[PDB]
Amino acid sequence: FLDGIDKAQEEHEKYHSNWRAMASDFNLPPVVAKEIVASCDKCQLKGEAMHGQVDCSPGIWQLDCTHLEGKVILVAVHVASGYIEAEVIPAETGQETAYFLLKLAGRWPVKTVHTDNGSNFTSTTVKAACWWAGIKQEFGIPYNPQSQGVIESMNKELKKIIGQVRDQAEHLKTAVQMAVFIHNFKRKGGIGGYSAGERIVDIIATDIQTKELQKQITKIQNFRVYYRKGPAKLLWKGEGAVVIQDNSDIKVVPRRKAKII
Amino acid sequence: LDGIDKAQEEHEKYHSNWRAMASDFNLPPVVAKEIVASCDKCQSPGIWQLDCTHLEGKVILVAVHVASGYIEAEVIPAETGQETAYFLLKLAGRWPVKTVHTDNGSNFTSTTVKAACWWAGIKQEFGVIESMNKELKKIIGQVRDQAEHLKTAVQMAVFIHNFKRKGGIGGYSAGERIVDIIATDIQTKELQKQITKIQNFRVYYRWKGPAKLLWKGEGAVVIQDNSDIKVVPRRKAKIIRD
Amino acid sequence: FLDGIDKAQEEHEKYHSNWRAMASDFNLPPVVAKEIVASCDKCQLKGEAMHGQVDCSPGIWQLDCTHLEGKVILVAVHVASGYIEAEVIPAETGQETAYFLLKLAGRWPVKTVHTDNGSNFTSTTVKAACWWAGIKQEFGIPYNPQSQGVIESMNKELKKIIGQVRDQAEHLKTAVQMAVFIHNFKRKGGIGGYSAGERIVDIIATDIQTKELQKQITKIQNFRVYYRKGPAKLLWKGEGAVVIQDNSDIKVVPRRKAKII
Amino acid sequence: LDGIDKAQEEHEKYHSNWRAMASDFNLPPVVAKEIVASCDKCQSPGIWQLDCTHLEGKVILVAVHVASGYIEAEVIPAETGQETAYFLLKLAGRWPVKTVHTDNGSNFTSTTVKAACWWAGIKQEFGVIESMNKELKKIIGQVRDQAEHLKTAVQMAVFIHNFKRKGGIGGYSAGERIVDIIATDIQTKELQKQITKIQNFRVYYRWKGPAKLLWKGEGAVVIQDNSDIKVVPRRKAKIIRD
Amino acid sequence: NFRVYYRDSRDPVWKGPAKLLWKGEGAVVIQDNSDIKVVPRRKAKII
Amino acid sequence: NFRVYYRDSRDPVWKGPAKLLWKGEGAVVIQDNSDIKVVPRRKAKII
Amino acid sequence: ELQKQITKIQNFRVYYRDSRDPVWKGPAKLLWKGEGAVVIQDNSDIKVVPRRKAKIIRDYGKQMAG
Amino acid sequence: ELQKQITKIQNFRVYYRDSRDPVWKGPAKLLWKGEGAVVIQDNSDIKVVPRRKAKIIRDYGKQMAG
DNA sequence: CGGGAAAATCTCTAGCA
DNA sequence: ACTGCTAGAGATTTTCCCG
DNA sequence: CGGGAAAATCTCTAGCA
DNA sequence: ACTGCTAGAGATTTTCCCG
Ligand SMILES: C[C@@H]1CCO[C@H]2Cn3cc(C(=O)NCc4ccc(F)cc4F)c(=O)c(O)c3C(=O)N12
Ligand SMILES: C[C@@H]1CCO[C@H]2Cn3cc(C(=O)NCc4ccc(F)cc4F)c(=O)c(O)c3C(=O)N12
Ligand SMILES: [Mg+2]
Ligand SMILES: [Mg+2]
Ligand SMILES: [Mg+2]
Ligand SMILES: [Mg+2]
Ligand SMILES: [Zn+2]
Ligand SMILES: [Zn+2]
């Protein structure tokens, strides 16, 4: 193909033909045309077609500031449950973001806050408020609201509820608290038919209960397992399969070729 | 199914509650509820307390969950009905507040607070609040130097009280207690819902007279007839709605 | 449920709870809660989750004006094939839109032009140019570029090619014509591995050939069919099934219970 | 497959072309191509013509597809090399232009037109254009009163000439003819591509000597050996690349 | 008869209910207070 | 080694190639002319 | 006569979509063409498709290839 | 003693996702919980899921219902 | 009939004011 | 009475090719 | 085991600066 | 070294309920 490849690069340097066009016009295998395209800097113009998956641990909260009727609404959400907190604040300022964050951390177990890189969240005053409550700050890739998919989706549900109840309140702060109430306790569905309030209660109570239960289980159930290796620490057994943790690496092995001691 | 008689015996012996029978013997909660409700010898989480403390010339408005000692407080600009109603709408949006106890003070008997309670569905009624005010004031005095304004200090005190101070029988903090109590009320409400759903159904088994329905299992149907719990195969009983 | 329904509307008038929340809180069948929500005007806030399908007949073209480097580029596309025409014009004016449209209609069989409701397309000067060439104008639902999905998608491919070849031309018009060339003849793929030029040639030649062939077939094959009715005109027969057109209604019937005369 | 001998006979009788054999007997085009290429007694669509007419003080620059009579023209502000090269880049983007014939005029031998032809891949070479100029001028004179500017009239004339005037053997217009001719060239190019693809393969059948490959069917493999076309089952022949 | 609530044109506020005059595949024609409008089916609910 | 072309931040012009330092699920860390950047995998191609 | 014409009309490939599926269905076999509808055969199934949802080609490449 | 604790830890439902599927997988059965991973049983299959991709609840509503 | 490699199909994304 | 689409990138299934 | 109705799941969309 | 999501609307498959 030496004559077919040299003419294809000469054509790609002009028209930037994709791999197919150069496979048809110069009698090339698909691999060679794809290679000629892959080596052109001017043709690498498209990312891969996937989406990530945000952290949904029980202690992660996403915060963001949204705007409505000239006012600033600082909104938070519990990612695992959908439970939201919100407040109209006079200004997007690290002072009042820190006040909001301290109130939140005082009402619920907030382990980690995920936010974008707005100035109020990247402020030295929030860093002090998050350090005092023992909160971990995760900032997202700048200019990527998809990294805040949960709270950004909650900026739409919250604003949608406010317009439904806006005419039952003179001020916007009352409508914001009405919308918080309605979302958290009057909208059911999701992973348990719950509302956001029931679901956060379940998530948190389940976290506590499971931590206590598994603490007891590990305190009692103390075995070592040899498979195929070292004395891996036993995690679970039953149904013809054993789960163990060998050097901080959890893997599933069948009951055969594994002995518990 | 097979342990209903054992649960009846354990109640007639120890007067246990349905949660234990349902956990120990493995019975649907409705059956154990009926077991505990068949003996006449065997016969809160939505109540908060509101008040206002004064400190350094500002007004702190504190709310306590009586069942758990959990505290919600914040500094307000004026001891008025607008800010009290706003605080109460906030709290009602955060936790399921069914009742609030107050001290008939002017800010609490206002039309705005009454309208907020009406919208949120809160029932207004006019010494734990005092002891918790004392504890909050002690914590505030402790942590005051770590902040410049008072509202920040109040929120640090609320954080400390709710999550850092532990005690009681099991050594849990107010946050874990409030979460557990609310989960228990969620279980209670779900059970009441299921009982109310099934109570409008009558069962004709083997045909014998109509009976109250308790559970519609996958391989059985549990019924209560003449104050006696019996098990019948699904194909041997017909359930109608009345 | 008379007490359960009256309390549910009283609650919906305040919080606007969805059908599930009112089914759980008031012991309602899903139909009744869904009905209570369906009767509330303030809750009808979301359309249905589908997309339409544009016309892709051989004679439909989508036109649009896109902007680049302060200049106006009037772009057209043959919907069935993807073949594009483009031109930098000094102004979005019905005069030059009509000139572009007359040139196009002179180079290809343009039966119908689909555009949005920009002033240059809704101009009385294009109406005269489309009337003279015997073109039919279809305007889209205002403020819905999805009705121009093809040409709007072509506004992105065209601009994408221009940046790839912009440094081989001093002026933007040369880069626009280079991009037209490259798209139409140097990018292969689609419903036949074709380029846009090959595909428009195939579409148009196939239209002519099939019209002629089916004209001959109908001129020769002249039968009437009775099924189950009137003498439906025969369209096709074979493989144990007959296709006929009874009173301008094409339907497929099996060979059984159908006689050809 | 079974009609290869009939096609060989029909060529030795009537000297037909491969398109007919492939259509009449139902043979892959490559086999009929080889049939027509085995007889030594049996042995344009990318060429356009450019020129400039003058009318009413403006310069019209006309392009004719020689094979079809299809016309592309437009009024340009100046008879220069920039506008000629722009016209030619436009045309090359619209139709597959492989060659353009011009009249060695100053605008056509410029460096800009040469560079445009180089980029587009057009080969520059220096009486149909005259007759089509006459016909375009006649049409323009006909339709002139229906417009105010001359460029609009030129485009109306181009529309009329390409799609409204019909003639020739079958009564087709220039548009249908150009489309048919370009489709034929597309078929020719696809056939040349497939022949070039298969020509670097050798077949060993039943083992006999290597043979040229023609078609790799689903139930057969067609080969040409010693100027004779034979059919062999796929399991009876092995194809290697050389 | 059908009630149609819709989102007409560059306006976020949903309007309705309007009479359904014609349901096509992808768009609907409605009548809302003696005003005939054509709304895509992404921007309308019919009850 | 891998070449990474990316779309950094509110800028349409694709940049690259950059050295791939770390590939996570959803985002990548790259080095482009002694400048370490974190780009989501929607906005980057790795070759 | 007529049979050659019919087997020629069935040599064209048809790409079509259904009224609620956004993906294009692979090449069927054209049986009959009309002003508003085309009749195709896709996997031993006879479908009637509107003209505005169908693309009819020959595939000059597969012809020239068997 | 221990067996009651294990059958209690297996009463919690787990909702999880895989690293490239955006849809949430239905309620599995929690076998073991850890700081970084949870071990579940979904349709007679034992999967190890990171803690950040799992939601663990009890469903105070199916409990109170059998 | 059985793996491996290559080809075809499938899935999913940004950008198009 | 009108209407999302297109092309590329990675993943996964089909087909083919020699044993 | 067989239909019908009701419930559960699936698919797909706008909006979130 | 980090990451789209949420809730609603219509369609389609499952489950259940009495024969
Ligand atoms: C003044 C005319 C008449 C009235 O409306 C405006 C505004 N407009 C807006 C876009 C635009 O929003 N493209 C983004 C996009 C969004 C969704 C989708 F499916 C396809 C898409 F291309 C156009 O392309 C466009 O031509 C116009 C226009 O022409 N006008
Ligand atoms: C000044 C800070 C810091 C730097 O960036 C700006 C700009 N920005 C833009 C959006 C926004 O584009 N939402 C639409 C959207 C698009 C895609 C998606 F997946 C989710 C979405 F919500 C925000 O929500 C937001 O908070 C900000 C912001 O805060 N800032
Ligand atoms: Mg933000
Ligand atoms: Mg935001
Ligand atoms: Mg436009
Ligand atoms: Mg546009
Ligand atoms: Zn390139
Ligand atoms: Zn409502």
Residue numbers in the entry:
A (entry chain A), C (entry chain G): 1 to 228, 236 to 268
B (entry chain B), D (entry chain H): 2 to 44, 57 to 139, 149 to 228, 235 to 270
E (entry chain J), F (entry chain D): 222 to 268
G (entry chain I), H (entry chain C): 212 to 277
Manuscript excerpt for this entry:
HIV-1 and other retroviruses integrate a DNA copy of their viral RNA genome into the genome of the host cell, a process that is mediated by the virally encoded enzyme integrase (IN). Each step of DNA integration, up to formation of the integration intermediate, occurs within a series of stable nucleoprotein complexes (intasomes), involving a multimer of IN and a pair of viral DNA ends. Because integration is an essential step in viral replication, intasomes are targeted by an important class of antiretroviral drugs, the IN strand transfer inhibitors (INSTIs).
We determined high-resolution structures of the HIV-1 intasome constructed from all the possible combinations of single and double mutants that underlie E138K/G140A/Q148K, and the triple mutant, with DTG bound. These structures were compared to the structure of the WT HIV-1 intasome with DTG bound. We began by measuring the median effective concentration (EC50) values against the single mutants in a single-round infection assays, which include E138K, G140A, G140S, Q148H, Q148K, and Q148R. Both DTG and 4d potently inhibited WT HIV-1 with EC50 values of 2.6 ± 0.3 nM and 1.5 ± 0.3 nM, respectively.
